[PDB]
Ligand binder design. Structure first.
Ligand SMILES: O=c1ccn([C@H]2C[C@H](O)[C@@H](COP(=O)(O)O)O2)c(=O)[nH]1
Ligand SMILES: O=c1ccn([C@H]2C[C@H](O)[C@@H](COP(=O)(O)O)O2)c(=O)[nH]1
Ligand SMILES: O=c1ccn([C@H]2C[C@H](O)[C@@H](COP(=O)(O)O)O2)c(=O)[nH]1
Lengths: 113, 113, 113
């Protein structure tokens, strides 16, 4: 905070996603329902793109579900990760890579604004 | 019904998604499992595009999960929202914006049909 | 196994997704949490693309949730489907089409690798 999306890294050259870490240590239980985890990373996005926050498979398989989230092109707030412990108690350590940001083209349409 | 996708609106110019509302008042509980909510909006999509139905974050955080759904380019039926109450009883009022439609390019491949 | 993505089929010409079947008979219950189902299909993907594994709506409505999964362009392993029974006992028969692979453009960015 406030760090822009350009400070994010890719695991490897062919990785679709930019890694997102939580800035806090947080414990999640199933009965808590959706929680919004801070990343300290902020919009906006490159021109003509929008973003999608998705889970990392290794984290999904460990029982933390990330709800897919749309990041609008002109969002200037903090990108947060919407997450829920599926079945068990999940512990997120500070700096753990818990989600990924995918960049996608933003298609123009004549839809009324 | 039957309204085409062109009647949908964007919240703002840089919003990735087109808002989708339910045409009915519906109550959802966790034990009901996935439910398909009517929108009165119909395919098909613009040429060379397909659609993805995603949650709105403000609705996800209130405990209604929208399952990501693929809308095929040539689908001519009613676009429905697949939704589940996560932990608590959720009440959807008629006209509440509960999901969003994202348009994405449809890539051609040589895969057999 | 090992079959490449090019052996996948589309249901119809305008279908966004390539169908993915499980190679095993598997029973899933809610208390099992996320499970990774084998497909016998392998990366990598076409140049400048990445993949997203999504649910088929007819399967989602029957109570099997597929967690959206990112397939990296240069992944050479087996594409697995991350799935969870929502509320009830779900039985997957061998050869049942349980998910779909969507191909999307991979946008270049200056993000550090
Ligand atoms: O997982 C998410 C989803 C949304 N947002 C922020 C960016 C979006 O532009 C904004 C509004 O959300 P939606 O209406 O696009 O869902 O909230 C996030 O930080 N994380
Ligand atoms: O959330 C969804 C997902 C699918 N469909 C419709 C449009 C799709 O073209 C069709 C078949 O679904 P899939 O096989 O693409 O998942 O069902 C919806 O109305 N809502
Ligand atoms: O549903 C999924 C998600 C991921 N993967 C494989 C391909 C990805 O390239 C790799 C690493 O996963 P992620 O870090 O991209 O989530 O695991 C799958 O087989 N199925």
């Amino acid at each position: 905070q406030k760090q822009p999306i350009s400070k994010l890294t890719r695991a490897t050259p062919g990785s679709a996603g930019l890694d997102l870490c939580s800035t806090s240590h947080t414990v999640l239980t199933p009965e808590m329902g959706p929680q919004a985890l801070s990343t300290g990373i902020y919009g906006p996005l490159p021109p003509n793109t929008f973003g999608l926050i998705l889970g990392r498979s290794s984290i999904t398989m460990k029982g933390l579900q990330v709800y897919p989230g749309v990041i609008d092109n002109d969002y200037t707030g903090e990108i947060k990760i919407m997450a829920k412990a599926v079945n068990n108690i999940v512990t997120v350590s500070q700096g753990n890579r818990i989600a990924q940001l995918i960049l996608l083209p933003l298609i123009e349409t004549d839809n009324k604004v």
